[PDB]
Design an enzyme around this catalytic site. Structure first.
Site, PDB file in Angstrom:
ATOM      1  N   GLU A  25      -1.455   0.165 -23.149  1.00  0.00           N
ATOM      2  CA  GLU A  25      -1.513   0.192 -24.751  1.00  0.00           C
ATOM      3  C   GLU A  25      -2.027   1.741 -25.368  1.00  0.00           C
ATOM      4  O   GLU A  25      -2.288   1.621 -26.337  1.00  0.00           O
ATOM      5  CB  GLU A  25      -2.077  -0.888 -25.551  1.00  0.00           C
ATOM      6  CG  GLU A  25      -3.488  -0.915 -25.387  1.00  0.00           C
ATOM      7  CD  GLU A  25      -4.198  -1.694 -24.155  1.00  0.00           C
ATOM      8  OE1 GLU A  25      -3.551  -2.000 -23.118  1.00  0.00           O
ATOM      9  OE2 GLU A  25      -5.381  -2.064 -24.119  1.00  0.00           O
ATOM     10  N   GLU A  53      -7.225   3.051 -18.214  1.00  0.00           N
ATOM     11  CA  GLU A  53      -8.018   1.850 -18.337  1.00  0.00           C
ATOM     12  C   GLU A  53      -7.909   1.361 -16.891  1.00  0.00           C
ATOM     13  O   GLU A  53      -7.103   1.510 -16.144  1.00  0.00           O
ATOM     14  CB  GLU A  53      -7.210   0.738 -19.165  1.00  0.00           C
ATOM     15  CG  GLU A  53      -8.165  -0.295 -19.474  1.00  0.00           C
ATOM     16  CD  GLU A  53      -7.480  -1.587 -20.264  1.00  0.00           C
ATOM     17  OE1 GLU A  53      -6.210  -1.417 -20.413  1.00  0.00           O
ATOM     18  OE2 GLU A  53      -8.095  -2.495 -20.588  1.00  0.00           O
ATOM     19  N   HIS A  97      -1.691  -4.798 -29.385  1.00  0.00           N
ATOM     20  CA  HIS A  97      -3.077  -4.085 -29.180  1.00  0.00           C
ATOM     21  C   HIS A  97      -3.454  -3.157 -30.120  1.00  0.00           C
ATOM     22  O   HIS A  97      -4.539  -2.689 -30.170  1.00  0.00           O
ATOM     23  CB  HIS A  97      -3.047  -3.346 -27.724  1.00  0.00           C
ATOM     24  CG  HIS A  97      -3.308  -4.115 -26.659  1.00  0.00           C
ATOM     25  ND1 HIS A  97      -4.531  -5.082 -26.510  1.00  0.00           N
ATOM     26  CD2 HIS A  97      -2.819  -4.454 -25.517  1.00  0.00           C
ATOM     27  CE1 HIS A  97      -4.595  -5.490 -25.467  1.00  0.00           C
ATOM     28  NE2 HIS A  97      -3.651  -5.448 -24.687  1.00  0.00           N
ATOM     29  N   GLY A 152       2.206  -4.256 -15.660  1.00  0.00           N
ATOM     30  CA  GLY A 152       3.179  -4.416 -16.592  1.00  0.00           C
ATOM     31  C   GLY A 152       3.365  -3.112 -17.450  1.00  0.00           C
ATOM     32  O   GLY A 152       4.180  -2.470 -17.738  1.00  0.00           O
ATOM     33  N   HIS A 182       3.221  -7.376 -26.588  1.00  0.00           N
ATOM     34  CA  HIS A 182       1.826  -7.307 -26.273  1.00  0.00           C
ATOM     35  C   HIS A 182       1.054  -5.747 -26.544  1.00  0.00           C
ATOM     36  O   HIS A 182       0.255  -5.749 -27.107  1.00  0.00           O
ATOM     37  CB  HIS A 182       1.702  -7.655 -24.690  1.00  0.00           C
ATOM     38  CG  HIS A 182       0.297  -7.627 -24.159  1.00  0.00           C
ATOM     39  ND1 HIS A 182      -0.211  -9.078 -23.967  1.00  0.00           N
ATOM     40  CD2 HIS A 182      -0.449  -6.545 -23.788  1.00  0.00           C
ATOM     41  CE1 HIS A 182      -1.392  -8.689 -23.434  1.00  0.00           C
ATOM     42  NE2 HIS A 182      -1.647  -7.221 -23.306  1.00  0.00           N
ATOM     43  N   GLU A 183       1.926  -4.742 -25.892  1.00  0.00           N
ATOM     44  CA  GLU A 183       1.208  -3.423 -26.093  1.00  0.00           C
ATOM     45  C   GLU A 183       1.264  -3.069 -27.616  1.00  0.00           C
ATOM     46  O   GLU A 183       0.456  -2.568 -27.978  1.00  0.00           O
ATOM     47  CB  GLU A 183       2.258  -2.494 -25.295  1.00  0.00           C
ATOM     48  CG  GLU A 183       2.271  -2.719 -23.807  1.00  0.00           C
ATOM     49  CD  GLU A 183       0.755  -3.102 -23.093  1.00  0.00           C
ATOM     50  OE1 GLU A 183      -0.161  -2.943 -23.626  1.00  0.00           O
ATOM     51  OE2 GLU A 183       0.966  -3.893 -22.062  1.00  0.00           O
TER      52      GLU A 183
HETATM   53  O1  LIG Z   1       0.724  -5.478 -17.616  1.00  0.00           O
HETATM   54  C1  LIG Z   1      -0.276  -6.524 -17.759  1.00  0.00           C
HETATM   55  C2  LIG Z   1       0.031  -7.687 -17.666  1.00  0.00           C
HETATM   56  C3  LIG Z   1       1.494  -8.265 -18.739  1.00  0.00           C
HETATM   57  C4  LIG Z   1       0.791  -7.947 -19.967  1.00  0.00           C
HETATM   58  C5  LIG Z   1       1.958  -8.707 -20.915  1.00  0.00           C
HETATM   59  C6  LIG Z   1       2.527  -9.610 -19.903  1.00  0.00           C
HETATM   60  C7  LIG Z   1       1.674  -9.875 -18.788  1.00  0.00           C
HETATM   61  N1  LIG Z   1      -1.801  -6.209 -18.472  1.00  0.00           N
HETATM   62  C8  LIG Z   1      -1.905  -4.869 -18.739  1.00  0.00           C
HETATM   63  C9  LIG Z   1      -2.367  -5.085 -20.335  1.00  0.00           C
HETATM   64  O2  LIG Z   1      -3.203  -5.908 -20.735  1.00  0.00           O
HETATM   65  N2  LIG Z   1      -1.847  -4.276 -21.173  1.00  0.00           N
HETATM   66  O3  LIG Z   1      -2.109  -4.277 -22.564  1.00  0.00           O
HETATM   67  C10 LIG Z   1      -2.688  -4.031 -18.051  1.00  0.00           C
HETATM   68  C11 LIG Z   1      -2.796  -2.871 -18.127  1.00  0.00           C
HETATM   69  C12 LIG Z   1      -3.686  -1.942 -17.371  1.00  0.00           C
HETATM   70  C13 LIG Z   1      -4.512  -2.515 -16.413  1.00  0.00           C
HETATM   71  C14 LIG Z   1      -5.030  -1.610 -15.518  1.00  0.00           C
HETATM   72  C15 LIG Z   1      -4.727  -0.854 -14.700  1.00  0.00           C
HETATM   73  C16 LIG Z   1      -5.259   0.073 -13.746  1.00  0.00           C
HETATM   74  F1  LIG Z   1      -4.271   1.030 -13.312  1.00  0.00           F
HETATM   75  C17 LIG Z   1      -6.536  -0.062 -13.653  1.00  0.00           C
HETATM   76  F2  LIG Z   1      -7.185   0.749 -12.734  1.00  0.00           F
HETATM   77  C18 LIG Z   1      -7.205  -1.247 -14.253  1.00  0.00           C
HETATM   78  F3  LIG Z   1      -8.534  -1.579 -13.849  1.00  0.00           F
HETATM   79  C19 LIG Z   1      -6.557  -2.114 -15.139  1.00  0.00           C
HETATM   80  C20 LIG Z   1      -4.345  -3.979 -16.225  1.00  0.00           C
HETATM   81  C21 LIG Z   1      -3.654  -4.837 -16.987  1.00  0.00           C
HETATM   82 ZN   LIG Z   2      -3.168  -5.985 -22.898  1.00  0.00          ZN
END
Ligand SMILES: O=C(CC1CCCC1)N[C@@H](C(=O)NO)c1ccc(-c2cc(F)c(F)c(F)c2)cc1
Ligand SMILES: [Zn+2]
Ligand SMILES: [Mg+2]
Ligand SMILES: [Mg+2]
Ligand SMILES: [Mg+2]
Length: 889
Positions: A268, A124, A305, A265, A301-302
């Site tokens: 998924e 992603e 998803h 973090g 969270h994961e």
């Molecule tokens: O970890 C978090 C923030 C946390 C989630 C729970 C507590 C706060 N968020 C991730 C997420 O939504 N996981 O569901 C999330 C995963 C991959 C990316 C992502 C990586 C890359 F290497 C990229 F190049 C890119 F474009 C995008 C960005 C974010």
């Molecule tokens: Zn997420």
């Protein structure tokens, strides 16, 4: 620089039905063979076949097993593979390729990369194209059959999506595993892992189908003893989706894998969730308390998803908030139920109104569904995530639990197995709205403005009470400031959860009530109100807005003491503090500007201080809530209320207010610090990793907050308490002892002591680094240089770099040194990091987000560093586009 526009969405002229991968990991390179079984879509108009493919070394490409030749039949420019349309078949065909990639040197941590001794992918948003050629967009859903081969000694554990259907030996000490994943999925959910992984496992039996699900949690061998809490959290997450939403896991197995090098973090990937080790691994001896809520949050969270993102996926990346806002909301519901503490919701509001409100009043402001992007790696913002979550939560507030659950199930049943858009979710919520209102003419068309309109609404109030009529009125106004995205802002659908408190006995005067404000202003009238109430507004923080309650400090104190809603109590306290801060800030600013030899400061309200004491001394009151009331609002919350903010004047303002309150309450603070010890530091369950007590951790938070207040105040003999605190088995305590010892000559003694305690656990050492970085030291710049030379060095681990530098950037007095030396330092780190990890380099730009809110000297200093960064010839696409937007170029 290509700009993608939301309005330009069009389905592809091609279809990819099957992906068959062979990923052969070798010592100096990885060879990726891919066969794509493809077709011509109904939207095809005879165009060239263009694949995304970034940084791939072509060995060969073929169509229907006929080798294509470069120049005549295709071109490749390290970004796009173009096959000229005259060579593209007109019916079903196979495209095949073999490419070479190099995970060992992939320090950007996107695509296929090496983290310590683990090979791992991150796809992603558009990272799959760094592994092989693809039409790399989430509406191109396909089946995946993946074989991975590797040296068996170095990589005994091989994982991908789906079921492992074969394992086999290969000559030369190699081995392979084949994974078949029949359900359609977008390519950003592909993942592969190879390494010498150790695990814990359990079997989960689903609630309704009674299917056995195998749960595996993996780490490197050194840290396998830190996996237990994550496994517990996964079981809890599965049960919550079953219990609240009626949703069961559909696959035979779910793997969670920790890696040391990760940009965010966790991720998924279907059946193969990959985590930053700091969001999966913990033990009570080697982790601070914050790790436990973090792991619960990120595992949850994961897991959530799997429905909101994986089974129902995205049509295009502009719909990102449809899966992220909704999954954050699902995790918030989960964590609130698991922790049973009011501080869970308060912590999310605290983050939103500081970090996200700052973003939304910055040049970076965007709606939760933006209209354009250049860099997807910069798209994953607190606006999309946290304001998105509040927008998803407002549906629950508007509908109530029963109809919210009905609407959510409509969304899942209608869209399961497909791509979806934000409109699909609003449609499902609208169907429940019609049910709840018993009105098939009701609609949520206005609600869609929450997806398109940027900026934070301001909601203000006026009141009227007629004692003879027993009639109370709340007049409400909403306003969003124009910005670069809309010159004219439209009124939103704002749900206002309200109570009315009887000021004589503190009791509720009306039943649960959610005002639906749908116009720029409205007056809500209440009859049979026997006395003039104090209104309790936006209970639970029911809309993501600036609240202007127009209450007196006397009324706010009454709510703080006697209201039923934790947020309104916390907000009333916040508002009292803000009034004080703005007043003293202006008095200090005047004295500075006019070069006054003497001047007066307005003291802190004595009844407010009395109220803090009353709550602190109440044994039935919550320790986490107590820690919030003795803390001033976040600096990044305060800055939204001050133009041309002089950070030195703000630091003086905070210091005066803390000293005012401490001069009255320090003896209370010390008495509580001592009386909380027995329960806060109880060791009964120290060696049980399954036993997590969120109330006890909040007691430690309160003790460590009070110790900080007492140490800053130089409370008599408090150093004795600090030294004894350094001997506690809990890292939250002994790292606190380092932090609060900054005000004493024992700081470097505790620096050495806690370093030796931290240095042999990778994640604990990062927590030590953060503690040093945020230490309130006059010599912090010299300390940072010592960390650079002795601990950090040239690490490319994002956790190491973020730990050393980001906490320091919140040092109001020192990061904002008027010389600009702190801005210069972080800009050097950003430019250095951008050479190998543009995504993380842009994360390190965070302190500059407020540049145009500071005093004019500091504005100039920050802008100069940003323009210096922009002039670097080797600047990345990520960093360039971010700084161009941030500096309004
Ligand atoms: O970890 C978090 C923030 C946390 C989630 C729970 C507590 C706060 N968020 C991730 C997420 O939504 N996981 O569901 C999330 C995963 C991959 C990316 C992502 C990586 C890359 F290497 C990229 F190049 C890119 F474009 C995008 C960005 C974010
Ligand atoms: Zn997420
Ligand atoms: Mg390459
Ligand atoms: Mg159950
Ligand atoms: Mg390391």
């Amino acid at each position: 620089p290509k700009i993608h526009y939301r309005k330009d969405y069009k389905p592809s002229g091609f279809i990819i039905n099957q992906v068959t991968l062979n990923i052969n990991i070798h010592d100096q390179e990885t060879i990726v063979r891919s066969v794509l079984d493809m077709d011509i879509s109904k939207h095809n108009v005879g165009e060239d076949l263009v694949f995304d493919g970034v940084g791939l070394k072509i060995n060969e490409i073929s169509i229907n097993n006929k080798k294509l030749v470069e120049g005549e039949e295709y071109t490749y420019d390290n970004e796009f593979l173009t096959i000229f349309s005259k060579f593209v078949p007109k019916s079903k065909f196979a495209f095949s390729s073999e490419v070479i990639i190099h995970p060992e040197t992939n320090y950007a941590l996107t695509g296929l990369y090496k983290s310590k001794n683990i090979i791992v992918s991150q796809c992603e948003a558009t990272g799959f194209r760094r592994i092989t050629f693809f039409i790399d967009r989430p509406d191109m859903m396909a089946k995946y059959d993946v074989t991975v081969t590797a040296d068996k000694e170095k990589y005994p554990v091989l994982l991908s999506n789906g079921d492992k259907v074969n394992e086999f030996e290969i000559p030369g000490g190699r081995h392979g595993a084949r994974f078949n994943d029949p359900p359609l999925k977008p390519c950003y959910l592909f993942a592969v892992v190879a390494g010498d992984l150790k695990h814990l496992s359990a079997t989960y039996i689903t609630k309704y189908t009674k299917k056995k699900v195998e749960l595996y949690v993996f780490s490197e061998e050194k840290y396998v003893s830190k996996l237990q809490w994550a496994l517990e959290c996964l079981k809890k997450s599965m049960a919550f989706d079953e219990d609240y939403f009626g949703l069961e896991y559909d696959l035979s197995r779910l793997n969670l894998v920790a890696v040391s090098d990760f940009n965010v973090g966790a991720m998924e990937n279907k059946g193969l969730n990959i985590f930053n080790a700091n969001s999966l691994l913990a033990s009570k001896k080697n982790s601070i308390d914050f790790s436990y809520a973090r792991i619960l949050t990120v595992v949850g969270h994961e897991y959530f998803h799997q429905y909101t993102g994986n089974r129902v996926t995205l049509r295009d990346w502009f719909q990102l908030t449809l899966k992220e806002g909704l999954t954050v909301h699902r995790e918030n519901l989960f964590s609130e139920e698991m922790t049973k503490t009011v501080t869970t919701r308060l912590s999310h509001v605290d983050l939103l109104r500081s970090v996200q409100f700052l973003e939304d009043s910055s040049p970076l402001s965007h709606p939760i569904r933006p209209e354009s992007y250049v860099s997807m790696e910069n798209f994953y913002t607190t606006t999309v995530y946290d304001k998105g979550s509040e927008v998803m939560r407002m549906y629950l507030t508007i509908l109530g639990e029963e109809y919210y659950k009905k609407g959510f199930d409509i969304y899942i049943k209608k869209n399961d197995g497909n791509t979806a858009t934000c409109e699909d979710f609003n449609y499902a919520m609208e169907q429940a709205y019609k049910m709840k209102k018993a009105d098939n003419s009701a609609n949520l068309n206005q609600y869609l403005l929450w997806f398109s309109q940027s900026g934070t609404p301001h909601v203000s109030f006026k009141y009227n009470y007629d004692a003879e009529k027993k009639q109370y009125s709340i007049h409400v106004n909403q306003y969003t400031k124009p910005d670069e995205n809309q010159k004219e802002k439209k009124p939103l659908f704002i749900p206002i959860s309200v109570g009315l408190i009887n000021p004589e006995n503190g009791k509720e005067m009306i039943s649960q009530t959610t005002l639906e404000l749908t116009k720029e202003s409205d007056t809500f009238v209440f009859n049979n109100i026997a006395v003039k109430p104090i209104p309790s507004l936006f209970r639970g923080f029911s809309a993501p807005v600036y609240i202007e309650d127009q209450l007196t400090d006397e009324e706010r104190i009454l709510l703080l003491k006697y209201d039923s809603d934790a947020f309104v109590r916390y907000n009333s306290c916040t508002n009292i503090y803000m009034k004080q801060i703005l007043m003293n800030y202006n008095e200090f600013l005047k004295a500075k500007n006019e070069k006054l030899e003497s001047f007066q400061l307005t003291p802190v309200n004595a009844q407010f201080i009395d109220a803090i004491k009353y709550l602190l001394e109440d044994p039935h009151a919550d320790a986490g809530f107590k820690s919030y009331i003795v803390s001033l609002p976040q600096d990044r919350y305060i800055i939204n209320f001050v133009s041309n903010l002089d950070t030195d004047v703000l630091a003086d303002t905070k210091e005066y207010i803390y000293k005012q309150i401490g001069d009255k309450l320090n003896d209370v603070y010390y008495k509580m610090f001592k009386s909380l010890e027995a329960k806060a530091d109880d060791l009964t369950y120290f060696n049980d990793e399954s036993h997590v007590d969120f109330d006890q951790m909040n007691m430690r938070t309160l003790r460590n907050t009070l110790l900080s207040l007492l140490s800053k105040a130089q409370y008599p003999n408090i150093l004795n308490e600090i030294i004894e605190h350094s001997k506690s088995p809990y890292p939250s305590n002994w790292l606190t002892s380092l932090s609060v010892s900054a005000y004493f000559d024992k700081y470097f003694e505790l620096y050495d002591k806690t370093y030796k305690l931290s240095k042999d656990d990778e994640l604990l050492l990062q927590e030590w680094l953060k503690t040093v970085s945020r230490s309130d030291r006059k010599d912090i710049y010299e300390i940072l240089k010592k960390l650079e030379n002795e601990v950090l060095k040239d690490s490319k681990n994002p956790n190491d770099i973020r730990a050393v530098y980001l906490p320091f950037t919140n040092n109001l007095r020192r990061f904002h040194d008027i010389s600009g030396k702190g801005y210069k330092l972080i800009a050097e780190v950003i430019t250095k990091t951008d050479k190998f990890n543009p995504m993380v380099a842009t994360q390190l730009c965070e302190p500059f987000k407020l540049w145009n809110k500071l005093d004019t000297k500091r504005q100039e200093l920050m802008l100069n560093e940003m323009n210096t960064m922009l002039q670097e010839p080797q600047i990345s696409n990520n960093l360039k586009e971010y700084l161009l937007r941030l500096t309004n170029k």
